[PDB]
Structures are given as structure tokens and as C-alpha cells.
């Protein structure tokens, strides 16, 4: 359902440096976290996609200059979902401070880094791409996909809504059962958004499926 | 054993950009300012003997006299791109003006015999 | 969880320009704070509710007297009545 | 100048009561007595270089105090007189923390390159501003104070304490030159220990720059365990024809 | 083929000087062990020392106080030789108060419970009839030498004067490798290490600390399997 | 130009003015003075007129 | 002195590979001794080493040393053994190059042990080499 | 490793002299740097690098490595 | 400790020369938001700035010069590395080229910018490519003092020395060193040592050991040679293909050997051999007596 | 106190019997504190077995030549020295070499008794020509380090017993050096590189382990003076 979509997004080549930085920051913020162990900060990011973890590791090594481990052992323990976990221990504090998770010698930033916000539209769509790669789903249970992506806390969700607005694409933040996400319902916005992210074959398949079924 | 008044603290200085002189636009000299190290005749002869033409050209033009080239070089370095081509030093223009003030009709020609006017 | 022991003890900046840098809305869509047409003023109010420099933002806004947007978790007429009271 | 006599001692005419800059008990003393061995050591004293010990840094055997003085004056200009004040136009209060009520740095306060010693402001007058800066000012609503800052800052690569400040005011009967309204001098002192790159010498024309400072535990030591304090190269003695050393 | 193993015995020359005899070692092996022990003793023996002072009416080192015969800079050099021993992990404070004429001997320092000053005959300053010395000293723990710019804290007051710290209980170490030809039908050695400490600990404790430091490195060497 | 920069500048200049001599800029000193590439070493036209492109095999491989 | 020497001979640079000239200097080697046995001359390391041969040397109807060779120590030893005294080498003093000089007449480059390149600046090197040891000659 | 590599003799085996090698390597380095600078744009101009590089490697070192490997040609215009 | 193509710069000088490059790099890694903050951070001397400087400075040659520049070897290109202090560290071998003493001399450092300038300073002016002197062609980059002494003490005859052993036969140089460690052998006593197949026999070496029906090759044959341990140790510094030396090495012999190496071998091997000779010379000069 | 940065040891293998160990990052100093001690204990503090004397039949202590053998006596002794053997009996034990006839006499033709083994039977000892005979007796015993030729114990004991030098230590060559390692924080931290080359019997790793054990015991000897003495603790 979404495996092909995320594969296509991961396989998309990227050139501009700022967009790569924004994508890395988004994925780290959404599907990543920090742990203060043995007196040092270690960054752990959990992905459930084959190529996405490699892409994130390569981006870190290239732009931020750091090394990762890329372990395949499942934190869930099932070992069937291939819950990849990429780790950064050497220079973890520097990576955290220079990627936007923590700034001002203070608490972790709830929303997306200020650098990602108030940037070019390319960086906004790159941040949305990273958010979709990290977490999200494409359900199509009934009449609409419900292209929902969950976020930690209202701040990240509303920041994603704001970023989507800059693309002239409708979006809506929602909260249920204490967990909040951003969703877009109408088919036209879904198609335009998926086209902008870079996926092509999945966009077509969805287009014909919707037109034939509806 | 005695301790001489030649401490290294007062001997070290370095520069990348600083004040410039008024008449000729070369870097200022000394250590109270930032100051630039001199590149005299003998060093020019050494570089000529090596066969290094591009290094000599950049030392003599975009580091001392090329007024519009210094800022362009700094911008190119900061933005991470190719260093531009050197121009024509200001000292040569000052020399031409000084000779012209002596009623000497100096003029630089092109491949054909037409003056360039030096801007 | 990932709280870094409340900012931890590893810091090298030791320099702060002002209370602008501690603004939470900077991590958030600026446009939502200036409701055009009719708009709404509750989601951004909730966002401001968690701001750590809400008092400073309100004080600066009142002193400079901006008559647009929502500052310190309050909108234009709340500021106006506070000024008139 | 140190003191030599005691509270009860009797002094005759011409006797010494206080030493000088480089005298010890009334007789010249320009250096120190160091235990020296002549031998080439691993190439660290190659071609006139010198190897020292760490004991000469621990015990301040070759430490010296150096002092420097900085001057700044406030005078008259076309657009009124310059002023020495603490109200620098646009700087954080953290910079203006050690300054006194008169805008002059406080005695006993350590400084590093970039700090301001005297806060001075000179009026500049109305000037035209580029459109971008005008738009920035409009956004931030700031106002040009009409005065720029010309404070006195310590040079690059300088450090030390503050020993004293001396201020002359033209209106206080001081004989300042014509056109100068106020003057101030600040004295900065620091103690320097011996470090490599410094030049040492003896009384027989044998000089050299310290190029190494070894720990105490890896200097050659005599049969009873006394390390040597300085290692010199024998090759320099015979060719230079100074067997006096 | 030789079954005899080394052994170490102690001899006391005086209160603070000892001679340790190790024998019978393999030939050509005494010098290396002696030098390893000497380096460890002269490098990595922990102690304590004064790391800062502040006087009542002083702002910096380059000044003098009324009623004393010496500058502050020439008093820092006198208190740098204090041989103190502390048992507290955190910094501790001591007070020195003297009034009237005489000598401010190191015994006049009143230390809290936990620390001690071991040379109570050191002469710090001399006071005349119109001088009073009120000074506060700070004591910490460590090993080696700290150059008084590591002792500078972030929130230093104008009145706090950092001072060089020398944590080293050992004073002079040497060794002699007697080629005694210990009668074992072959050649052997006899190492004799002479240790003198500066009246802060006894040489046995210094040797024990050196051995404890040296055993760990060869411990991580032997775990190679 | 070279003769003037060597020594006796006044005599050289007043002799060159009358004859209306023209300098062709072939030596090293003149090119150094006016600030261009000396005609020796890497400043020759034999070496500086070339074209650098990858081989077909190398481009195909990557 | 060095300033004057550099100025007189600044515009001497190599500009060819070979001028084809057959002219050369007659340089002597292996001065005859009083014992009747040829012995290599004392000043040969700075007179004939690093210098090509203008014309081929023929002894006993062979080619002892072919033309245009570096003329190192091995060739000199072979020539002395064969019983030769004078050799016609190539020098800048007898160069017919229409433009400047040529690499073959100059000879080997002493600073790199290979034939001088077509862009080398030999005049400045000569001036510097002559002028550098002037601070050791007693005045 | 560093300025020493690749060995100068191996490079000179691929050219005529040092003077031509300087220009050849410098031109290739300028091409590589120009390619890197305008990589953000979607452009078809300049090519390379043709070898595996590091995170931030000087373009001159890469140019020399390609020259040694024999992945370039020089013509006379 | 430096190599023939390296120099040590104080970090203050390095940070001042490389200010624009450092600013660009630490804006690129996101350590700074813009140029203004990057310049402020560089000027105030933070901690990350030096970590970035130590990697921007890599593979960027600098030209070192000492006035007066009497010949073209007075300017040479070195690879810089950061050191703690305020004085420049210079290799002991290049001093004779600069005519540099360590009695308080000063030297100047220049930084090439463009790709052509870097290519020239890296291919034409490099320090490990200028062994020979342009005036006469004899090497100037050679061990001069405290190294000639060490190599002379190592390789010399025991005329008045206390030569222990003097008749022993060893199966290798390792066994000879093991005997030397114990007070059983001298560095100058004459002994018979057997060498492996790889070694090349000395020039001359007129007898391949007399035999009947068994030949020997110039290389790949084990032979016994009567020499001192010092010469055996000295021959481990020269290349693998160089013939065994076997004679006392003063300063003329060392000049001959260095000239032969420069004439017959590539430049990297010659530089490595010079570094080996320097290290061994210092080590054995300290223990010379 | 606390070490604050735990050094670690790593190995590299060059040949079957050559290794290079790296210990880093050591505190300032401490590179020469445990470098020379490591070298000395590796070279002369590890047991082994080796030949001590031989008795070639028909040849006295004169080394003019061995009849029927191409190689001279010095070559024979040097060849015997390269032999690597292992033993178990404290007392010296004698084995017989009985090769005969033209051809090649190697170490594979020896007849060691029980408890003694030869770890390189392919070693070449000599060449026989003209139907000569080679009869030899080899005495092997245990020891430590390198001991030169034990001189004549008893002049009148026999005629032909030639003593030889004995190399007992498995480790043949050892070297070490120290360098600066740290870049991030203050530099001058030491890194130690030790190059080890042993013989065919033992591996370098076992030699390093034995050296570590010996040094640990030797310095625990001194540590036993006062167990409750503060040193440099390490943690894990
Ligand atoms: S209170 Fe002010 S600073 Fe804080 S989030 Fe609201 S608008 Fe921003
Ligand atoms: Mg000198
Ligand atoms: Zn010619």
C-alpha cells in the first residue's frame, strides 16, 4: 500500500544541499530521539524502510560529517518488520546541536527546526517528504486515501500544516486519543501533493484507481 | 643562563585582510597594524627561476594592487567557487599618470595601433 | 524520555541575544498568527499558551503597541481593553 | 624594589637598603644558575636549539612581569565634543559589565583581546542610508543615535590584569594640549613563563631558542637522582673557539 | 629452569626515606623496572595543594598590603610550598589571621577537620606593628601540576587570585641495579630503589600507589588472550 | 621600461622620449611590471592552449 | 653584483628542442701525466659533465660515444680508457638557434638531472648561482 | 599520504613535462570545482568526479588522481 | 619528528591565514547560520573553529621563505599541520637550503589561492623534490650535523675501542642485536653475519664462495660477510636493492651515496631513505658518547 | 583518581609470525614507561627450549672442515642454531642424527625421544656428497632468553663436544615507538606501536599475553606493600 510509495520516494535523487539538510532534520525529529547514557548523548532513529535508512545514513555522513552503525536488530523484537535502527554515538552532541533538535543550550525543540521553516518551497516540500518517509500511511479505506501522518505534539503537526499551505495544498491537523496527525482528504490535493514529493508511478496508479472506482 | 628580551609573543603576526595605503593601494606595512609581509625583488627572481607564473601573477595582482579583484576574490572564497582572473594593478596606473604629468606622451596599444585609454 | 536531563550540562554558546531566540512560534507557521478574512484565533492561542516567554512577548507588544496579530496569547481587542483598563 | 634591612638592623652611610630591578643583595643578578650537561639529545637541540626542563616552569625560575600602557583622549570636533561615557550605542550590557560609572574599566579586572577599556562615543551627524538598511530599521523600528562608538579596545593577542588608570580633565587645571578635552591612560600587566620559541643565552656568546620542554621524569639524572635542567650541544663549543664556558 | 621468583623487602633509612630491595631478577632486567617505577612515582601519585587565595584588601597579584614586608606576588611563591594533605573530594577552605608584629608561620593557619598542614615551620610573611593579615585559602585534590589558568573559574570575582598547584608527595627517587651475581649458578640482578617523599606520606604508600597504577596497564595487556 | 627600472631613469626616459621608442613587452621584467604572465615556464602559449576532456570509456563507466 | 648580473641576463630562456648545429667547443680531458698513462683531468666535474657531444667520437673504427648523449662519468671513463684527450662538445656560445637558445646546446639541467625543458629560465638561474657564493669570497 | 601522493614520476609518465602537467591538472580541477558549485541547479555542464572521493576533498587532489589513473585526454587547440 | 614534506604552524597563525575558508566551512556544516555569526565565532575563538580549521587546512600547501633569498631553494612549499605554541617547526634537513640557524631566525609564510598556484606549489616547488643544488648538482638536502656523527660512530673501525666478541658467528642480525643488548658484543667489533636471500652482495665481492658445480646469483643467495654490527644496522636504512656498503661513512661517502640514490631511484624512495638516515643518525648520536 | 580515558590495545597481523600491536590513547608520558619494559619482558622473560651443544663424529674442536660434507663447521653450527625445538625434561636430553649417503640432510631425519618435538622438519642442515657419513648428537634443554656459548665446563670430559649459542626465547625481534594521537582535546597524548616477530612455534598474541601476566605479577609484588592505597582507577 505504502511500501511502493516510500520506495519510490527513497529512490528519488536529490541535489540541493539545503533540501537534504531539511529532510535529515525532519526524519530525525519525527522518527528519532536522543538518550543521555554513560554521560554522552546518542542519537537513535528507527525506520521501517529498506532504502530510507541507507539514505539517511549517507546524508548524515555527507553533509554533517558523521558515522553511523545501521543495525538491523528489531527493537520491537519480532524481527519480521525489519525495524532498522540507525545510531550516532561519536559526536552525538555536535550532530544534535547542528541539526536543529537542540538549540540555545536548552531543552529539545518541540516543533521543526526554525531553519526548515521560513525557507524556500523546495525545503518545505523536502521536510514534508522526510516526514512522510519517517511516519505516515495511505489507507484508502473508503472514498479517500486519508494521507495521514502522525507527529509528536501539536507543534510538529501544525508546522507541517503550515509547510503544506506554502505549497497551495489544503491540509488539516487533527487530534484523537491523545495522538495528533495531519491529514488531507480530497483527492485532488492528495494527487498534487504526491506529485510534488516526486513519486510518479504511484501517483499514476492512484489516479487510475480513483478514477475507475469513483 | 640569561633570558633575552626577544620573546616570541612579540614576534608573531599574521594577516588575511587589513588596512591599505592611500596613494598606492597596497597593504600597509608594520606590526602595530595587521600589516603584510613584503615580496621583494629576490623572491620574484626565485619564483621566476622555478617557472611559477600563475603564483607570481596572483601574488602581484589580486593580493596587493588589483582594487576590484580583492573583494571579488574574498566573495569567491566565501561562496566556494573559482577564483576570478586578475586585473591590472593600480601602481601601473599611478606610474602612467606620473609620467604623463612630465609632458611624456605614454600610451598602451592593442594588437592594432589604437590606444586602450586605461578606463 | 529524550529530555537530555533538562538541557544537560554540555553547552558552549554561553551567549543569548534576547528573548526572541526563546520564542516558540518561530517553530511554527507565521501565517496562522495573523488570521485574515474572518479566520480563527484559538489554535495559535494554544500554541502561545505553552510559550516560555509569553510575558515578555506581551510586555514588548504592549509597549510598542502593535494593533495586528496575536501576541502573548491575546488578540487585538484583549490588548486594547487591557490598555484601556 | 625589594627590602634588605630588618626592623632592628643598624645602617652605615652608603649601605644598601633596597635592591633594584635585577640586583640581588646589592650586586648584579641577570639570570639563574642551571645544571647543564653537554650532549646531543635526540635531535631536539640540533643546530643551536635548546632543551629545557619542566622544573623551570613549575617554580617560576625564568618568569618575568611585563607591563603595557594604553592611551585614549576625547577632544572637540565639528559636530560637538566627543564624550567618554558608558552608554555605548548598540552593545549588550554584558560587555558593559566591568566598566566603571565613568565608562573606564575597573582595577583588578582581567581582559582578553576585544574587550573595551574606555567607552567613547563620537557624534557623526545625519547621513544617507542604503534602502536595505532603511527597510531593516523600519522592520525593527530602531533609531540611529547620531553617535558612533570609538571606544578603546585591547589589541589582538593581548591579555593581562589591570594595574591602574590615570585620567586628566582639561577643566580640572590639567595642562592638556590644545584641542584635547580629556585624556586617560590604562596599565595592563601580565606574568610570562618560559616557553619554546623564547631565546636564552650565556655570558660567552652562546645563544639559542628554546625548542623543547621535557617533563622532569625523562631528563638525564645523576647517580643520586637529580635531573639536569638544561641540555646543550657540544658541537658548538670547539668550532666557535670559546672554551671559557 | 630457575625456579626462584622475585621478592621485595623494605629498609628504613630515616623517617621519610626508604630503600626497597627486589631480587633475584633476570639479567639485564633491573634497569627497566627501576625506571618504570621511577617514572610512575614522579608522575602519577595523587596529593593535594592550595589552588587559590583571597586577601581582605587586595584586588590582584601585582600589589602590596599595608604592614607587611613582602608583595602579594612574593607571598604566592611562599604559599606555593605549603605541604597540605586533604581527605575531601570537594574544595575546602582554610583561614589565616594574624595581628601585630612577628612572623606569620605556617602553623598559624587554622585548617578545618579533614585537612592538615605538615610543615608548620614555613615562614610566609613578616608583620610590623601596624599590619594585620587576613587571608583565605582553597585546597583541592589531584596529581601533577596545574598552571593556574586551569584553576580560573568562569564566575571569578575581581578579588579571587588563582595560584599554581603542585600535587606531588614524592621528592626524590633513584635506583641502583647491583649485578651481585646472586649465587644461582648463573647471572642475575638485584634492584635497589631509594625513595624520599616530602613529609606528606610515607614511601611505602607511594610505592603501593605506583604499583597499583602500573598493574592496571599490564592487566589490560594480558587480557589479549 | 626595463632600462628605466634598472638605473639612470631620467637619462633613459629622456632618450626614449626623443626617439619615440616602442616597447613590445617580450622580457620578464616588463611583464612583471604591467602584471601579466611572464613568457617562461607555465606562462608559455605552448602549454596553456589545450582541451581537457574525459575519455569515452571513463564517461561510460560512471 | 647579483642585481647587475640578474639584469644583464634576464631574457635568456630556452625556446627550442634542437637547432641542428654542428659547431662546438674543443674541451680537453685526460691530461697526459709524467708517467705516460692518461689520467682524468682534475676540473672535469665543472667543465665537461652535463654537456652533450656535437660530433661522434670514432676510435678503432667504432663508436666510443654516440652524438647527443648526456656525457656522464661512465662515458668519460670509457673515453679516457680508449685514449682520447679532446672532445667537441656543444655550448650556448655556438648556438645557431634563431630564437634564443635550445635545450640540446645548453645541456642537462643540474638542478634535476635531466635535459632542460623548453620553458626553462636559464639566465636567472645562472645569475643567482654566480652571485650566491659572493658572500664567502674574502674582500 | 597527502601532498606526497600520487608520486610525481607516475604523473610525469602520462604527460610531457612538469609545465604541461600543471596546466592540465589545474584545468581539470577548475572543471570539477565548477561542477560542484552549480550542483544545486539542474544543469548538464562539466562532468566528474570519475573516482571515489571523500566527504570534502580538494578538487586538485581528485584531478591528479584521475590523471594518474588515465581517465583524461589532452589535445592542442 | 616531521617528514621532509611537512611543516608545523601555530594555530593562531593558521586560523588568521585561513579565516575565509574556515568561515565558509563552518557555515557549510550548519555550525553557523550565516557569515556574520560565523565571523563572530571565528573572531571570538570558540572550540569548534579549531576542529574545522584542522580539516580545512589539509592538503593545502604553504610557501615558506627566509630573507635574503639568494637562490631559488630559499622558497619552498610545505604541507602545514597545527602545533601548540607560537613558533614555526621546520624539518632539520631543509635548514642548509634556507641557510637557517636556530639562534633566533624568522621565516615568512605565504598562502596560494587559485588552482594554478596550488598546482605549481604542489608539483614544481614541493620540498621533497629539490634534493640537488642548481649551482653544481650536488645535494644540499642531506644529513649535516649530529647525523653525520651518528652514522660515523655506527659505521667505523674499532682501532682504540673496546671490541668484545671479535670472533663470533651469528645466523642473522636479530641474534647479533640480542647479543648486543647483553654486555657481550660491541657495535664495532668484527663478526661473521649470514644474510637472507633478498640482500644484494657488496659491489666488488670478488669471491662467490669457491665451489664445484653450484653457481650463485647476484641476488637471492645467502652469504656470510665479515663486518661489524654497526654496518649491518646501517644497511637496513638504505633501499632493498642497494648493494651492501661495508666501509666507514664520513660525510664525503654519505654525499656519494645520496647522489647515487638521487641518480638511480625515484623521488619518494629517496625521501624515505633520507628520513630513515636522519632518524638513525639522531638515535645513534645520542648514544655516541 | 580516575583515568578519564581508557586506553585500548589492538592487533594487526602481517605474516604468519609477525604482528603489530597499537595501544592508545595513553596519558602524557606512559609511552616509555611500559614500552621498554614490554620489549625486555618479551625478549628475555618467557621460557623456551633449545640446543646447547653438539658432538659431530670424527671431528675434534678444530673447525678446519668436516670430511664428506660440503659445508664447513661454522655453517653447520649456524644451521643447527636456526632449529626450533620444544622440550619437557628439565635435564638436558640427547638425540641422534644418523643420515648417510649422498643427498640432502634435513631436520626431518632426526629421531627425537619422547617429550621433545621439532617444529620445522623441512629445515635444511647440510649436503652430503661422495657417499659420506654424518653422525651427530644434539643436546637440548630449557631456559630463558639468549645465553652465549657456555665455555668448557670440564676440559678433560671429552674431545669433540662443541658448545653453541642458545636462543631460548620464542620471540626473535621486538621494536617499539611512540607518537602523538589526540586531536579533539589537548594534544600530546601518547600512542604506542610495538612490532613483534617470533619463530615458527609460538604466535605473537601468546607472547604478549605471557608478558602481560609476568609484568602484572612483578608489579603486584610492589602493590602488596599497602593494598589500600589510591592509584589510577579505570572503571570497566
Ligand atoms: S507568546 Fe509571543 S513569542 Fe510566544 S509563541 Fe506567542 S507570539 Fe510567539
Ligand atoms: Mg643565526
Ligand atoms: Zn643550439
UniProtKB/Swiss-Prot annotation, chain A:
Induction: Autoregulated. Expressed throughout vegetative growth and sporulation. Could be post-translationally regulated.
Deleted gene: phenotype: Mutants form unusually long aerial hyphae that fail to initiate septation or chromosome segregation.
Organism domain of life: Bacteria
UniProt record, GO biological process: cell division; regulation of sporulation
Keyword set, alphabetical order: Activator, Cell cycle, Cell division, DNA-binding, Repressor, Transcription, Transcription regulation
GO molecular function: DNA binding
Activity regulation (record text): DNA binding depends on WhiB.
Family note: Belongs to the WhiA family.
Function: Involved in cell division and chromosome segregation. Plays a central role in the initiation of sporulation through the activation of multiple components of the cell division machinery. Acts as a transcriptional regulator that is involved in the direct control of genes required for key steps in sporulation, including the cessation of aerial growth, the initiation of cell division, and chromosome segregation. Functions almost equally as an activator and as a repressor. Required for DNA binding by WhiB. May function cooperatively with WhiB.
Name recorded for this polypeptide: Probable cell division protein WhiA
Protein source organism: Streptomyces venezuelae (strain ATCC 10712 / CBS 650.69 / DSM 40230 / JCM 4526 / NBRC 13096 / PD 04745)
Gene from which this protein is expressed: whiA
Positions spanned in the full protein: 1 to 214 of 327
